[PDB]
Every structure is written in structure tokens, then in C-alpha cells.
Amino acid sequence: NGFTHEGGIDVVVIGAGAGGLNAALVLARARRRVVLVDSGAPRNAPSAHMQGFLSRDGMAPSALLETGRAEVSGYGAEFIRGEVDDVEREGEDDAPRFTVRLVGGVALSTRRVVVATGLRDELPDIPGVRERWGKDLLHCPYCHGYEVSDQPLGVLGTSPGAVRHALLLRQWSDDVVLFRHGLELTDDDRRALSARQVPVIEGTVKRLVVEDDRLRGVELAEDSGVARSTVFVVPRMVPRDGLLTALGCERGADGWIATDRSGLTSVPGVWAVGNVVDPRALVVSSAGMGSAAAFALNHQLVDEDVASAVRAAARTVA
Amino acid sequence: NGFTHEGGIDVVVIGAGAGGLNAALVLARARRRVVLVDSGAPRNAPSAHMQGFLSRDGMAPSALLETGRAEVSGYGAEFIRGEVDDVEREGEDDAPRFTVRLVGGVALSTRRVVVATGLRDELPDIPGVRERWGKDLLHCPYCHGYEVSDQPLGVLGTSPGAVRHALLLRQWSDDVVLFRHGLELTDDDRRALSARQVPVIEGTVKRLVVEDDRLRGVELAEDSGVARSTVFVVPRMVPRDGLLTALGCERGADGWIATDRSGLTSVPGVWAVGNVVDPRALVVSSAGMGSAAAFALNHQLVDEDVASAVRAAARTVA
Numbered sequence: 001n002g003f004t005h006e007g008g009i010d011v012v013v014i015g016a017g018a019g020g021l022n023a024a025l026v027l028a029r030a031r032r033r034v035v036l037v038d039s040g041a042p043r044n045a046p047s048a049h050m051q052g053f054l055s056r057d058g059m060a061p062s063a064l065l066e067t068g069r070a071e072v073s074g075y076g077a078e079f080i081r082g083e084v085d086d087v088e089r090e091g092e093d094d095a096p097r098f099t100v101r102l103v104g105g106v107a108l109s110t111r112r113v114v115v116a117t118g119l120r121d122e123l124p125d126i127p128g129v130r131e132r133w134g135k136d137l138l139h140c141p142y143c144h145g146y147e148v149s150d151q152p153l154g155v156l157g158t159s160p161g162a163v164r165h166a167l168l169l170r171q172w173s174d175d176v177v178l179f180r181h182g183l184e185l186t187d188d189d190r191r192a193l194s195a196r197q198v199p200v201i202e203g204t205v206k207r208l209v210v211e212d213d214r215l216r217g218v219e220l221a222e223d224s225g226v227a228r229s230t231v232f233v234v235p236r237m238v239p240r241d242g243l244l245t246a247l248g249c250e251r252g253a254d255g256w257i258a259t260d261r262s263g264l265t266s267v268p269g270v271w272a273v274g275n276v277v278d279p280r281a282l283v284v285s286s287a288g289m290g291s292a293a294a295f296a297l298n299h300q301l302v303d304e305d306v307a308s309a310v311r312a313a314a315r316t317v318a
Numbered sequence: 319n320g321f322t323h324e325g326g327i328d329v330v331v332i333g334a335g336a337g338g339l340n341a342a343l344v345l346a347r348a349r350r351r352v353v354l355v356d357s358g359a360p361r362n363a364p365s366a367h368m369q370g371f372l373s374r375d376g377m378a379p380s381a382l383l384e385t386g387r388a389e390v391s392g393y394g395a396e397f398i399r400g401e402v403d404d405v406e407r408e409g410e411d412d413a414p415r416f417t418v419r420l421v422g423g424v425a426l427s428t429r430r431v432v433v434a435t436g437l438r439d440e441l442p443d444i445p446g447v448r449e450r451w452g453k454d455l456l457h458c459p460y461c462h463g464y465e466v467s468d469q470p471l472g473v474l475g476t477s478p479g480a481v482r483h484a485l486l487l488r489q490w491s492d493d494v495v496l497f498r499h500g501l502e503l504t505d506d507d508r509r510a511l512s513a514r515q516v517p518v519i520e521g522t523v524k525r526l527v528v529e530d531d532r533l534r535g536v537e538l539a540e541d542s543g544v545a546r547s548t549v550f551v552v553p554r555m556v557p558r559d560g561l562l563t564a565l566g567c568e569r570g571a572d573g574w575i576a577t578d579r580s581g582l583t584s585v586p587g588v589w590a591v592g593n594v595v596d597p598r599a600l601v602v603s604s605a606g607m608g609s610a611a612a613f614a615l616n617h618q619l620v621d622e623d624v625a626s627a628v629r630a631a632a633r634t635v636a
């Protein structure tokens with residue numbers, strides 16, 4: 001059935017976005033035997049160009065990943081395109097080991113695991129939203145705001161974060177409208193929206209209006225329409241942390257898997273980096289936390305390597 | 319005397335390494351008015367190529383910075399090559415303002431400050447060390463280890479971290495020697511070094527031996543020599559955090575300026591990113607924390623923008 005190497009696998013990195021790739025890069029350069037398993041679904045694949053990553057502003061996501069994979073494979077790390085559906089812990093707390101199992105039946109044994117599986121954007125079920133996602137139905141103002149500066153922007157009231165999102169988007173345009181969509185607004189919400197001059201249009205949103213492959217506006221329940229060039233939503237962002245939960249990784253009060261500042265979880269030998277633990281992590285921040293995880297992980301592997309060697313030398317004792 | 323802009327300056331970024339540059343990149347894309355002040359001394363300038371930064375593995379540090387500066391200036395952020403010698407806080411906790419003063423007398427007023435000033439490596443005063451720093455007298459095994467794989471490596475006993483450093487370097491070569499240099503070793507140190515087969519050579523290190531522009535070895539007090547291709551040290555790493563201390567930023571128990579996970583210090587409106595707060599932050603991690611700081615800083619500026627607008631609308635009240 002399974003995948004083996006005679007020296008033994010040191011780290012399995014689950015997910016090869018920027019988080020997993022930068023973790024693997026540092027670990028492979030540290031002469032650790034790394035296998036990456038990745039299902040091929042980068043969160044920002046719908047957007048043609050990524051922005052805000054130092055020295056790679058405007059780079060295509062596919063190009064970042066192609067370049068990164070080439071770097072990582074050049075150091076001898078191995079890639080599998082597949083889906084991990086189980087990780088099981090073995091051994092003592094001071095010498096962790098894991099079995100990683102893929103859909104289809106392939107399994108690997110490893111000393112450590114880095115989970116870098118990202119998050120899923122659950123979008124509102126409104127006609128046009130799926131089709132335009134990543135083009136002109138968007139979420140992230142840091143990713144897209146500059147590119148739609150001063151344009152007529154809309155925000156759909158499909159999430160409790162919609163009011164704050166409209167106020168945030170006013171930093172990029174003086175023409176921002178909130179489609180309330182029956183969202184409950186507080187007195188503070190209304191005062192803030194009025195003060196920042198964001199109109200609130202009442203009514204159930206029926207569909208996004210798309211003509212000649214571009215968004216033209218938003219249609220309301222009884223056929224009224226409002227022209228917009230770009231519409232924003234706050235999706236329900238769900239981290240792909242099922243493997244971490246199954247391992248017994250503790251969650252913080254906020255509901256996300258808890259980590260220290262290197263990404264180490266409550267389960268010994270298990271690191272987590274990127275959107276799976278931080279919904280605010282842009283691509284370069286995910287890469288940054290991958291590097292930090294690799295730094296800490298290798299350091300602690302050395303501590304185990306030393307402790308095991310000391311143990312063995314004291315057993316044989318000359 | 320000073321530097322002004324009629325719209326007002328939103329952020330001054332002090333230091334334009336990867337940390338400051340990626341902070342400025344995101345902030346300028348958020349249409350905030352940014353001025354960077356940088357003294358032109360990147361910590362890794364002595365090393366011809368940087369390693370381990372996703373998609374830029376092997377890039378010259380000067381090329382990373384040139385590319386980054388071009389991106390940032392393209393969005394309208396402004397650069398000054400100079401040295402900030404004072405930052406003074408003004409206004410209330412809920413509407414911070416700062417005066418940034420440069421050596422020479424130029425001053426700027428700004429709403430926020432990001433300190434990304436790095437750290438200084440204080441090296442041992444041994445002949446040859448200064449000359450070979452960044453070439454074949456090195457510190458960072460993640461940065462340099464791969465490039466000297468399997469070579470005869472030395473470690474100088476000039477720091478309390480030297481023993482752990484030798485044990486770490488054994489991950490990259492089976493030929494690693496510790497020059498004790500009168501460093502006090504514990505029984506645990508000796509057991510660990512023996513178990514990982516790192517010889518400990520006794521004697522005061524006199525000089526690094528350099529011939530034809532390459533390190534050849536280490537000479538001891540009474541003219542004995544040991545041939546090595548590369549020598550490592552653990553410098554005393556001193557963060558350039560004087561401006562943060564003067565602002566009243568709290569230090570953690572570890573002695574470094576305390577931050578939340580976005581880099582926000584205990585002083586409202588003051589962020590800190592990179593080596594100035596984290597001695598383990600490699601280049602991509604510094605860039606990552608710059609982005610995270612920008613995200614948080616802009617968010618809180620919006621909160622202030624909204625609160626001020628609500629305040630003003632309630633004053634005039636129609």
C-alpha cells in the first residue's frame with residue numbers, strides 16, 4: 001500500500017500553499033526528509049494576480065507556487081498530489097511519531113507533521129456570486145482595494161461583519177453602498193455608516209447582474225437595480241482544521257486551533273501555519289509562519305536527536 | 319527645517335529591510351500616506367545571497383531591497399535615506415500622533431509609527447572575525463548550513479549558546495568541532511557533545527587563519543592550528559529598540575520589547591516588526607510580520623477615522 005524511505009521521513013507537510021511550501025523549503029535546506037501532500041486547491045486561485053507580497057507584487061498565484069515547488073523539489077523534498085484524510089499519533093510525548101493516511105489508501109510514517117491546509121470561504125447563495133468570485137465579487141480589501149480605487153463599490157449584508165467591511169472599504173472609495181439584505185443594524189451601525197457617508201439600501205438582494213463578462217450591479221427583490229462595478233462580501237471562513245481536531249489539538253476561546261508564536265499546537269510534534277489557524281494571514285504572512293514553524297520544528301528535532309544519542313551512549317556505556 | 323504633506327502623514331516606517339518594506343507595501347496599497355526613513359544597513363548585507371525566502375531562494379539581498387523599494391515607491395510611498403534619533407508621542411491615547419526626528423534636524427509629524435530597525439550582531443574580538451563575517455565566519459545554520467553541508471565546520475566558544483550551536487550544526491555535517499575558548503562546560507554539555515561526536519578542542523583561540531581570500535582554520539594560543547573551511551559563532555544579538563524604550567514600550571520577561579501577534583506594542587499607535595523584536599525572524603518572517611502589522615494598523619486607523627467622523631457629525635448635528 002504505502003510510501004516509505006529507508007532513512008525515515010522526518011516531516012510531512014499537509015498543504016502546499018505558501019505556508020506549507022516555505023516550511024518545506026527551510027526544512028529541506030536543513031537536510032530533513034520532507035514529503036508534501038497537497039490537494040491542489042489554493043484559496044486565491046480565483047484571482048489572476050496576487051498583491052502585497054514583497055518583491056512579488058502582481059505575480060500570478062500559479063507562478064508563485066510553480067517557482068516555490070521547483071525550489072523545494074530541488075533540495076530533495078518529495079511531492080504527492082492527493083488528499084490526507086487521517087493523521088494518527090504514535091509513541092511517547094518525548095519521541096512523537098505519526099501515520100499520515102491519504103484518500104485511496106496510501107500511508108506514510110513520519111516524525112513530525114505541519115498542517116497548512118488553509119480555510120474555505122463559504123459564500124452566500126445568491127445567483128452570480130459563485131461565477132464572479134475572485135473577479136468582481138470579492139472579499140479582501142488589502143488584496144483588491146487598490147485595484148478598484150474610487151470605483152462604485154457594493155457590500156452585501158450577508159454576514160455580521162458586513163457593516164465593518166463597508167466602513168473599511170471607504171478607505172479605498174468615496175462611493176460605497178451597503179445592501180442591508182435584512183441584516184439587523186444597531187444604532188451604532190447606523191451612526192457610523194451615516195458619518196462615513198455609506199448609503200444603506202433596503203431590500204432582499206435577488207442576484208448579481210452580469211453582462212459581457214463583467215459585473216454591472218445588484219438586483220433587488222422587486223426588480224429595482226443599483227449599478228456597481230465591484231461587490232464585496234464577508235464569507236463564513238471555515239479553517240480546514242479537522243485533522244488537528246482529531247489529533248486532540250486544543251482550541252482557543254475564539255474557536256481556532258491554538259498555537260504558540262512558531263505555530264506549535266498543544267499536541268507534541270504537530271505544527272499549524274497559515275489560514276488554517278489565522279484568517280488574517282495574507283500570502284507573505286503564511287510564508288513567514290511556515291519559515292518560523294520550520295525553525296522551531298528543526299530545533300526541537302535536534303533536541304530529540306541529542307537526547308536519543310545521550311540515552312543510547314549511556315545504555316551501551318562504552 | 320522639516321518634512322510635510324498637506325493631507326498629513328499617516329505612517330512613518332523606521333527601517334526598510336523586508337519588515338519595514340512589506341509593512342509600507344500593504345499600507346501604501348491601502349492609500350495611507352507613508353514615509354520610510356532608512357539608514358542603509360541591512361543586517362545580511364555581508365552575505366552575497368539570501369536563502370529560504372519562498373520564490374526568492376538565492377536572491378541577492380540588494381536585489382530584494384531594490385525590487386521592494388520600487389514596488390513601494392510605485393504606490394506613492396516616500397523614501398528618505400537617514401537615521402531617526404527620536405520619536406515623541408503627542409495627543410490622547412485614542413488619537414495618537416508622533417513627531418519623528420532625524421539626525422541633522424529634519425522632523426515629520428505622523429499618526430502612526432512602525433519600528434523595523436533590526437538588530438546588531440556583536441562579534442567576538444578575535445583577529446579575522448570582522449573580515450570574514452558573512453563569508454566563512456557565520457552564525458545562522460538555516461541561512462548557511464546547506465551551502466556548507468558535510469564540510470569541516472568549527473564553532474568558537476565565545477557565547478553561552480556555543481554548545482547548543484555545535485549540536486545544531488551537526489545536522490549539516492558530521493565534522494563539527496567546538497573550540498572551547500575557556501567556556502564553562504557542564505556535565506550535560508560534555509555528555510551531549512560526546513554523544514553527537516563533536517570534538518572539543520581546548521585552548522584560547524588566537525586568530526582565524528585566512529589565505530588567498532578564504533578561511534583555512536583556527537590558530538590557538540601557543541601556535542597549534544586546526545584546519546576548518548567554515549567557522550560559526552553565536553553573536554551577542556542586540557535589538558535596535560532604543561526608540562521603543564524611549565516611548566515607554568514595555569519589555570517582556572525575556573528582555574525584548576513586548577508585542578501582540580500583529581506587532582502592536584504597549585504604546586498606542588506604535589508597531590514593531592522583524593529582528594528588533596524577534597531574533598529568530600528570517601527575512602520572509604520579517605516580511606510576513608510587516609504585512610500583519612500593516613493589516614492591524616490600517617484596521618485601527620479606520621476605527622479612529624470612524625470614531626472621529628461620528629464625533630464630528632454629533633457636534634455639528636445636522
Ligand SMILES: Cc1cc2nc3c(=O)[nH]c(=O)nc-3n(C[C@H](O)[C@H](O)[C@H](O)COP(=O)(O)OP(=O)(O)OC[C@H]3O[C@@H](n4cnc5c(N)ncnc54)[C@H](O)[C@@H]3O)c2cc1C
Nearest residue numbers: 015017019039040041043044050051084118274275282283
Ligand atoms: C479571491 C481571493 C484573492 C486573494 N488575493 C490575495 C492577494 O492578492 N494577496 C495576498 O497576500 N493574499 C490573497 N488572498 C489570501 C490568500 O488566499 C491566503 O493568504 C493564502 O491562501 C493562505 O495560504 P495558506 O498556505 O495558509 O493556504 P492555501 O494557499 O489555501 O493553501 C492550502 C493548501 O492546502 C491544500 N489542502 C487542504 N486540505 C488538504 C488535505 N486534507 N490534504 C492535502 N492537501 C490539502 C489545498 O489544496 C491548498 O493547496 C486571497 C484570497 C482570496 C479568496
Ligand SMILES: Cc1cc2nc3c(=O)[nH]c(=O)nc-3n(C[C@H](O)[C@H](O)[C@H](O)COP(=O)(O)OP(=O)(O)OC[C@H]3O[C@@H](n4cnc5c(N)ncnc54)[C@H](O)[C@@H]3O)c2cc1C
Nearest residue numbers: 333335337357358359361362368369402436592593600601
Ligand atoms: C551574515 C548574515 C546572513 C544572513 N542570511 C540570511 C538568509 O540567507 N536568509 C534569511 O532569511 N535571513 C538571513 N539573515 C537574517 C536576516 O538578516 C534577517 O532575517 C533580516 O535582516 C531581518 O529583517 P528586518 O527588516 O527585521 O531588519 P534588517 O533587514 O536588518 O533592516 C533594518 C533596517 O533598519 C535600518 N535602521 C536601523 N536603525 C535605524 C534608524 N534609527 N533610523 C533609520 N533606519 C534605521 C537599517 O539601516 C536597516 O536597513 C542573515 C543574517 C546575517 C547576519
Ligand SMILES: *SC[C@H](NC(=O)CC[C@H](N)C(=O)O)C(=O)NCC(=O)O
Nearest residue numbers: 139140141142143279280281282617
Ligand atoms: S483584505 C482583508 C479581509 N478582511 C478584513 O481585513 C476585514 C476583517 C478582518 N479580518 C477583521 O478584523 O475582522 C481579510 O480578512 N483578508 C485576509 C485574508 O486572508 O484574505
Ligand SMILES: *SC[C@H](NC(=O)CC[C@H](N)C(=O)O)C(=O)NCC(=O)O
Nearest residue numbers: 299457458459460461597598599600
Ligand atoms: S540560522 C539560525 C541562527 N541560530 C539558531 O537558529 C540557534 C539559536 C536559536 N535562535 C535558539 O533557539 O537559541 C539564528 O538565530 N538565526 C536567525 C536569524 O535571524 O538570522
Ligand SMILES: [Cl-]
Nearest residue numbers: 161164165168
Ligand atoms: Cl471587515
Ligand SMILES: [Cl-]
Nearest residue numbers: 479482483486
Ligand atoms: Cl544554537
